[PDB]
Scaffold this active site. Structure first.
Site: not given
Ligand SMILES: [Mg+2]
Ligand SMILES: [Zn+2]
Ligand SMILES: Cn1ncc(C(=O)NCc2cocn2)c1C(=O)Nc1ccn2cc(-c3ccccc3)nc2n1
Length: 311
Positions: A66, A70, A105, A215
Protein backbone atom coordinates in the site's frame (compact mmCIF):
# COMPACT_ATOMS: atom_id res chain seq x y z
CA UNK A 1 5.49 21.38 -22.94
CA UNK A 2 4.47 17.70 -23.47
CA UNK A 3 5.96 15.03 -21.23
CA UNK A 4 7.36 12.33 -23.59
CA UNK A 5 8.46 8.85 -22.66
CA UNK A 6 11.04 6.61 -24.22
CA UNK A 7 9.71 4.56 -27.13
CA UNK A 8 9.13 1.24 -25.21
CA UNK A 9 7.13 3.03 -22.47
CA UNK A 10 5.30 5.29 -25.01
CA UNK A 11 3.86 2.08 -26.60
CA UNK A 12 3.45 -0.23 -23.59
CA UNK A 13 1.81 2.46 -21.33
CA UNK A 14 -1.35 2.11 -23.56
CA UNK A 15 -1.70 -1.59 -22.71
CA UNK A 16 -3.62 -2.72 -19.61
CA UNK A 17 -0.75 -5.02 -18.42
CA UNK A 18 1.94 -2.30 -18.37
CA UNK A 19 4.24 -2.35 -15.28
CA UNK A 20 5.52 1.21 -14.37
CA UNK A 21 9.06 -0.09 -13.59
CA UNK A 22 11.46 0.09 -10.63
CA UNK A 23 12.64 3.69 -11.30
CA UNK A 24 10.57 5.75 -8.79
CA UNK A 25 11.81 9.14 -10.19
CA UNK A 26 9.99 8.33 -13.46
CA UNK A 27 6.50 7.71 -11.81
CA UNK A 28 5.45 11.42 -11.51
CA UNK A 29 6.26 11.98 -15.21
CA UNK A 30 4.38 8.73 -16.13
CA UNK A 31 1.32 10.13 -14.19
CA UNK A 32 1.51 13.60 -15.86
CA UNK A 33 1.91 11.90 -19.31
CA UNK A 34 -1.35 10.01 -18.54
CA UNK A 35 -3.26 13.19 -17.45
CA UNK A 36 -2.03 15.07 -20.61
CA UNK A 37 -3.40 12.31 -23.01
CA UNK A 38 -6.54 11.41 -20.96
CA UNK A 39 -7.60 14.92 -20.00
CA UNK A 40 -5.51 17.45 -22.01
CA UNK A 41 -2.40 19.69 -21.51
CA UNK A 42 -4.85 22.39 -20.12
CA UNK A 43 -6.70 20.29 -17.41
CA UNK A 44 -4.31 21.45 -14.65
CA UNK A 45 -1.66 24.16 -14.16
CA UNK A 46 1.58 22.10 -14.44
CA UNK A 47 3.19 24.20 -11.56
CA UNK A 48 0.16 23.09 -9.36
CA UNK A 49 -0.15 19.48 -10.68
CA UNK A 50 3.61 18.86 -10.06
CA UNK A 51 3.24 20.25 -6.52
CA UNK A 52 0.07 18.16 -5.79
CA UNK A 53 1.79 14.86 -7.05
CA UNK A 54 4.91 15.39 -4.80
CA UNK A 55 2.69 16.11 -1.74
CA UNK A 56 0.61 12.98 -2.50
CA UNK A 57 3.79 10.96 -2.84
CA UNK A 58 5.15 12.24 0.50
CA UNK A 59 1.93 11.15 2.29
CA UNK A 60 2.22 7.44 1.13
CA UNK A 61 4.34 5.43 3.60
CA UNK A 62 7.12 2.88 3.02
CA UNK A 63 4.87 -0.23 3.49
CA UNK A 64 5.48 -3.34 1.28
CA UNK A 65 2.30 -3.02 -0.90
CA UNK A 66 0.00 0.00 0.00
CA UNK A 67 2.69 2.39 -1.24
CA UNK A 68 3.31 5.09 -3.84
CA UNK A 69 4.01 2.41 -6.51
CA UNK A 70 0.48 0.99 -5.87
CA UNK A 71 -1.03 4.49 -6.24
CA UNK A 72 0.57 5.09 -9.67
CA UNK A 73 -0.17 1.49 -10.80
CA UNK A 74 -3.92 1.88 -9.94
CA UNK A 75 -3.99 5.28 -11.80
CA UNK A 76 -2.38 3.64 -14.87
CA UNK A 77 -5.16 0.92 -15.05
CA UNK A 78 -7.78 3.76 -14.83
CA UNK A 79 -5.85 5.55 -17.64
CA UNK A 80 -6.10 2.41 -19.82
CA UNK A 81 -9.89 1.98 -19.11
CA UNK A 82 -10.59 5.66 -19.97
CA UNK A 83 -8.47 5.61 -23.13
CA UNK A 84 -10.27 2.43 -24.36
CA UNK A 85 -13.78 4.06 -23.59
CA UNK A 86 -13.09 7.56 -25.03
CA UNK A 87 -16.64 8.84 -25.52
CA UNK A 88 -18.33 7.18 -22.41
CA UNK A 89 -16.87 9.67 -19.84
CA UNK A 90 -17.24 13.39 -19.10
CA UNK A 91 -14.25 15.79 -18.90
CA UNK A 92 -14.89 16.15 -15.10
CA UNK A 93 -14.90 12.37 -14.72
CA UNK A 94 -11.53 12.01 -16.60
CA UNK A 95 -10.02 14.76 -14.21
CA UNK A 96 -11.52 13.32 -10.99
CA UNK A 97 -10.84 9.56 -11.57
CA UNK A 98 -7.03 9.75 -12.22
CA UNK A 99 -6.64 11.96 -9.14
CA UNK A 100 -8.91 9.64 -7.12
CA UNK A 101 -6.74 6.60 -8.04
CA UNK A 102 -3.50 8.45 -7.18
CA UNK A 103 -5.04 9.44 -3.75
CA UNK A 104 -7.15 6.30 -3.01
CA UNK A 105 -4.75 4.80 -0.39
CA UNK A 106 -3.11 8.02 1.00
CA UNK A 107 -1.46 7.48 4.44
CA UNK A 108 -2.22 3.74 4.50
CA UNK A 109 -0.39 1.95 7.29
CA UNK A 110 -0.52 -1.65 5.86
CA UNK A 111 -3.48 -2.70 8.07
CA UNK A 112 -7.10 -3.59 7.19
CA UNK A 113 -10.27 -1.88 8.54
CA UNK A 114 -10.76 -4.98 10.86
CA UNK A 115 -7.34 -4.56 12.46
CA UNK A 116 -8.00 -0.84 13.22
CA UNK A 117 -11.32 -1.86 14.90
CA UNK A 118 -9.77 -4.66 16.99
CA UNK A 119 -6.84 -2.37 17.98
CA UNK A 120 -9.43 0.37 18.85
CA UNK A 121 -7.43 2.85 16.68
CA UNK A 122 -8.77 6.43 16.94
CA UNK A 123 -9.69 6.37 13.15
CA UNK A 124 -12.18 3.52 13.98
CA UNK A 125 -14.08 5.90 16.43
CA UNK A 126 -14.05 8.77 13.87
CA UNK A 127 -15.34 6.48 10.94
CA UNK A 128 -17.38 3.35 11.89
CA UNK A 129 -17.36 1.95 8.30
CA UNK A 130 -14.87 2.23 5.40
CA UNK A 131 -12.47 3.50 8.13
CA UNK A 132 -9.27 3.69 6.03
CA UNK A 133 -11.17 4.91 2.87
CA UNK A 134 -12.81 7.88 4.69
CA UNK A 135 -9.29 8.68 6.00
CA UNK A 136 -7.83 8.51 2.44
CA UNK A 137 -10.50 10.95 1.17
CA UNK A 138 -9.88 13.25 4.21
CA UNK A 139 -6.13 13.24 3.41
CA UNK A 140 -6.96 14.01 -0.25
CA UNK A 141 -8.99 17.19 0.68
CA UNK A 142 -6.17 18.27 3.14
CA UNK A 143 -3.50 18.18 0.36
CA UNK A 144 -5.88 20.00 -2.08
CA UNK A 145 -6.12 22.93 0.47
CA UNK A 146 -2.30 23.36 0.92
CA UNK A 147 -1.34 26.84 -0.62
CA UNK A 148 -0.44 26.24 -4.34
CA UNK A 149 -1.98 22.67 -4.42
CA UNK A 150 -5.50 23.48 -5.68
CA UNK A 151 -5.31 21.78 -9.14
CA UNK A 152 -9.12 22.29 -9.50
CA UNK A 153 -9.16 26.10 -8.60
CA UNK A 154 -10.04 27.10 -12.26
CA UNK A 155 -13.25 24.92 -12.27
CA UNK A 156 -16.59 26.71 -11.57
CA UNK A 157 -17.99 26.44 -8.02
CA UNK A 158 -20.44 23.59 -9.01
CA UNK A 159 -18.01 21.74 -11.30
CA UNK A 160 -15.65 21.86 -8.20
CA UNK A 161 -18.40 20.35 -5.99
CA UNK A 162 -19.16 17.66 -8.62
CA UNK A 163 -15.44 16.69 -9.02
CA UNK A 164 -14.94 16.35 -5.16
CA UNK A 165 -18.14 14.26 -5.11
CA UNK A 166 -16.76 11.91 -7.88
CA UNK A 167 -13.41 11.55 -5.98
CA UNK A 168 -15.19 10.91 -2.65
CA UNK A 169 -17.50 8.16 -4.05
CA UNK A 170 -14.57 6.71 -6.06
CA UNK A 171 -12.36 6.39 -3.00
CA UNK A 172 -15.11 4.98 -0.69
CA UNK A 173 -15.82 2.39 -3.48
CA UNK A 174 -12.24 0.93 -3.03
CA UNK A 175 -13.51 -0.54 0.28
CA UNK A 176 -13.84 -4.13 -0.92
CA UNK A 177 -16.63 -4.82 1.73
CA UNK A 178 -18.85 -2.60 -0.57
CA UNK A 179 -17.71 -4.22 -3.84
CA UNK A 180 -19.81 -7.49 -3.39
CA UNK A 181 -23.21 -5.80 -3.30
CA UNK A 182 -22.14 -3.18 -5.84
CA UNK A 183 -21.27 -5.85 -8.38
CA UNK A 184 -24.51 -7.96 -7.67
CA UNK A 185 -26.64 -4.90 -8.32
CA UNK A 186 -24.73 -4.15 -11.53
CA UNK A 187 -25.13 -7.89 -12.51
CA UNK A 188 -28.99 -7.74 -12.05
CA UNK A 189 -29.24 -4.30 -13.77
CA UNK A 190 -27.27 -5.47 -16.87
CA UNK A 191 -29.13 -8.92 -17.19
CA UNK A 192 -32.69 -7.42 -16.67
CA UNK A 193 -31.51 -4.60 -19.05
CA UNK A 194 -32.31 -1.64 -16.68
CA UNK A 195 -28.64 -0.36 -16.75
CA UNK A 196 -28.84 3.33 -17.76
CA UNK A 197 -25.56 5.37 -17.92
CA UNK A 198 -27.62 8.68 -18.05
CA UNK A 199 -28.86 7.69 -14.56
CA UNK A 200 -26.33 9.20 -12.08
CA UNK A 201 -26.83 6.40 -9.42
CA UNK A 202 -25.98 3.87 -12.23
CA UNK A 203 -22.82 5.74 -13.40
CA UNK A 204 -21.79 5.98 -9.74
CA UNK A 205 -22.05 2.15 -9.50
CA UNK A 206 -20.13 1.65 -12.77
CA UNK A 207 -17.36 4.05 -11.56
CA UNK A 208 -17.24 2.10 -8.28
CA UNK A 209 -16.64 -1.19 -10.17
CA UNK A 210 -13.91 0.50 -12.33
CA UNK A 211 -12.24 1.52 -8.96
CA UNK A 212 -12.35 -2.10 -7.69
CA UNK A 213 -10.93 -3.29 -11.08
CA UNK A 214 -8.03 -0.71 -11.04
CA UNK A 215 -7.38 -1.40 -7.34
CA UNK A 216 -7.07 -5.17 -7.91
CA UNK A 217 -5.15 -4.81 -11.26
CA UNK A 218 -1.98 -6.53 -9.83
CA UNK A 219 -3.84 -9.77 -10.80
CA UNK A 220 -3.98 -8.50 -14.46
CA UNK A 221 -0.21 -8.16 -15.12
CA UNK A 222 2.13 -10.68 -16.73
CA UNK A 223 2.64 -13.69 -14.41
CA UNK A 224 6.17 -12.66 -13.26
CA UNK A 225 4.79 -9.19 -12.08
CA UNK A 226 1.69 -10.72 -10.44
CA UNK A 227 3.71 -13.38 -8.60
CA UNK A 228 6.36 -10.93 -7.31
CA UNK A 229 3.66 -8.42 -6.22
CA UNK A 230 1.83 -11.28 -4.33
CA UNK A 231 4.93 -11.40 -2.03
CA UNK A 232 4.41 -7.65 -1.21
CA UNK A 233 0.73 -8.07 -0.43
CA UNK A 234 1.40 -11.17 1.77
CA UNK A 235 4.22 -9.34 3.71
CA UNK A 236 1.54 -6.80 4.79
CA UNK A 237 -1.10 -9.55 5.49
CA UNK A 238 1.29 -11.57 7.65
CA UNK A 239 2.54 -8.46 9.54
CA UNK A 240 -1.17 -7.76 10.32
CA UNK A 241 -1.51 -11.41 11.43
CA UNK A 242 1.48 -11.04 13.79
CA UNK A 243 -0.22 -7.87 15.27
CA UNK A 244 -3.49 -9.87 15.67
CA UNK A 245 -1.51 -12.48 17.68
CA UNK A 246 -0.10 -9.63 19.91
CA UNK A 247 -3.69 -8.58 20.70
CA UNK A 248 -4.38 -12.29 21.69
CA UNK A 249 -6.51 -13.10 18.54
CA UNK A 250 -5.82 -15.97 16.03
CA UNK A 251 -5.75 -14.18 12.64
CA UNK A 252 -7.58 -15.47 9.51
CA UNK A 253 -5.31 -17.97 7.54
CA UNK A 254 -4.65 -15.22 4.81
CA UNK A 255 -2.72 -13.32 7.56
CA UNK A 256 -1.05 -16.26 9.36
CA UNK A 257 2.52 -16.69 8.08
CA UNK A 258 2.42 -20.22 9.64
CA UNK A 259 -0.08 -21.23 6.84
CA UNK A 260 2.11 -19.86 3.90
CA UNK A 261 2.11 -23.42 2.37
CA UNK A 262 -1.65 -22.85 1.48
CA UNK A 263 -1.16 -19.50 -0.43
CA UNK A 264 -1.82 -21.01 -3.91
CA UNK A 265 -5.26 -22.35 -2.85
CA UNK A 266 -6.03 -19.00 -1.09
CA UNK A 267 -5.19 -17.11 -4.34
CA UNK A 268 -7.59 -19.44 -6.38
CA UNK A 269 -10.48 -18.59 -3.94
CA UNK A 270 -9.70 -14.91 -4.27
CA UNK A 271 -9.64 -15.05 -8.14
CA UNK A 272 -12.90 -17.18 -8.13
CA UNK A 273 -14.81 -15.20 -5.44
CA UNK A 274 -13.52 -11.62 -6.24
CA UNK A 275 -11.27 -10.89 -9.24
CA UNK A 276 -12.97 -13.00 -12.03
CA UNK A 277 -16.48 -11.78 -11.12
CA UNK A 278 -15.16 -8.17 -10.96
CA UNK A 279 -13.52 -8.21 -14.43
CA UNK A 280 -16.44 -10.28 -15.96
CA UNK A 281 -19.18 -7.75 -14.95
CA UNK A 282 -16.82 -4.94 -15.99
CA UNK A 283 -16.29 -6.58 -19.45
CA UNK A 284 -20.09 -7.01 -19.79
CA UNK A 285 -20.59 -3.26 -19.07
CA UNK A 286 -17.47 -1.92 -20.95
CA UNK A 287 -16.47 -4.44 -23.61
CA UNK A 288 -13.06 -2.96 -24.44
CA UNK A 289 -11.80 -3.85 -20.82
CA UNK A 290 -11.87 -7.52 -21.85
CA UNK A 291 -8.01 -7.73 -21.80
CA UNK A 292 -8.14 -7.33 -17.92
CA UNK A 293 -10.50 -10.39 -17.73
CA UNK A 294 -8.24 -12.34 -20.14
CA UNK A 295 -5.01 -11.53 -18.12
CA UNK A 296 -6.79 -12.36 -14.84
CA UNK A 297 -7.89 -15.78 -16.17
CA UNK A 298 -4.27 -16.41 -17.39
CA UNK A 299 -3.03 -15.75 -13.77
CA UNK A 300 -5.78 -18.10 -12.31
CA UNK A 301 -4.32 -20.82 -14.60
CA UNK A 302 -0.71 -20.07 -13.41
CA UNK A 303 -1.90 -20.58 -9.75
CA UNK A 304 -3.59 -23.86 -10.79
CA UNK A 305 -0.16 -24.81 -12.24
CA UNK A 306 1.54 -23.96 -8.92
CA UNK A 307 -0.89 -26.22 -7.01
CA UNK A 308 -0.19 -29.18 -9.50
CA UNK A 309 3.49 -28.77 -8.52
CA UNK A 310 4.37 -27.68 -12.17
CA UNK A 311 5.74 -24.53 -10.28
MG1 LIG B 1 -7.41 0.80 0.04
ZN1 LIG C 1 -5.53 0.30 -3.20
C1 LIG D 1 -8.17 -7.85 -0.27
N1 LIG D 1 -7.28 -8.11 -1.40
N2 LIG D 1 -6.80 -7.22 -2.24
C2 LIG D 1 -5.82 -7.79 -3.05
C3 LIG D 1 -5.71 -9.17 -2.65
C4 LIG D 1 -4.84 -10.14 -3.24
O1 LIG D 1 -4.58 -11.22 -2.59
N3 LIG D 1 -4.50 -9.75 -4.54
C5 LIG D 1 -3.60 -10.69 -5.31
C6 LIG D 1 -2.31 -10.07 -5.73
C7 LIG D 1 -1.92 -8.79 -5.40
O2 LIG D 1 -0.69 -8.69 -6.03
C8 LIG D 1 -0.35 -9.85 -6.68
N4 LIG D 1 -1.32 -10.68 -6.56
C9 LIG D 1 -6.72 -9.40 -1.69
C10 LIG D 1 -7.20 -10.62 -1.00
O3 LIG D 1 -8.10 -10.50 -0.12
N5 LIG D 1 -6.56 -11.80 -1.25
C11 LIG D 1 -6.83 -13.01 -0.53
C12 LIG D 1 -8.22 -13.40 -0.13
C13 LIG D 1 -8.41 -14.58 0.54
N6 LIG D 1 -7.35 -15.37 0.79
C14 LIG D 1 -7.11 -16.53 1.58
C15 LIG D 1 -5.74 -16.78 1.54
C16 LIG D 1 -4.96 -17.80 2.21
C17 LIG D 1 -3.56 -17.77 2.13
C18 LIG D 1 -2.77 -18.71 2.80
C19 LIG D 1 -3.40 -19.74 3.48
C20 LIG D 1 -4.78 -19.87 3.45
C21 LIG D 1 -5.58 -18.88 2.86
N7 LIG D 1 -5.14 -15.88 0.72
C22 LIG D 1 -6.07 -14.94 0.36
N8 LIG D 1 -5.82 -13.76 -0.26
Amino acid sequence: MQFTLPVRLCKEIELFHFDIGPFENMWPGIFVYMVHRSCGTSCFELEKLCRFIMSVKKNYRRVPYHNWKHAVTVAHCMYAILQNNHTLFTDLERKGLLIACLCHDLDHRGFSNSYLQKFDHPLAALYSTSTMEQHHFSQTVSILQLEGHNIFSTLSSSEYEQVLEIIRKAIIATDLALYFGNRKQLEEMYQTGSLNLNNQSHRDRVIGLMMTACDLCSVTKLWPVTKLTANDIYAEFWAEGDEMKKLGIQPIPMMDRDKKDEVPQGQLGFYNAVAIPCYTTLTQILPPTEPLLKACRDNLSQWEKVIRGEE
